Amino acid sequence: LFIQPFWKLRSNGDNVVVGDKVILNPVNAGQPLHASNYELSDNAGCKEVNSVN
């Protein structure tokens, strides 16, 4: 996974700081992780994490 800056403050080559916000892009998928709104039937109140724009 590539860790990329969600904020314009940080650029490539900078050091990540705890408490910030980042984007996780898989090397092969090339699509950032997304917390969809599709509730799982098996467990109530649980969404799904999928790799998509």
Add this chain to the structure above:
Amino acid sequence: SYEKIKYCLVAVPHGNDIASLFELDPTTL
């Protein structure tokens, strides 16, 4: 308008008032 914001920025001729003092905080360590 108090919109969600309470105060708005504006230009003031005089500069000896205490309403023109601003502190700068860093974004990194």
Add this chain to the structure above:
Amino acid sequence: CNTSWKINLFMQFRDHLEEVLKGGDVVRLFHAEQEKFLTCDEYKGKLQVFLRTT
């Protein structure tokens, strides 16, 4: 004449480094999120401060 030129101090030699935000320096306040420059301009008889779009 007999005038005396009192020499006040404004900045030291050590603080004149160009790698520092020095007092009296002139800069522009760029906005990273909106990618716009802060500006103040005369609009309708009263000066207003805003973020210009380009």
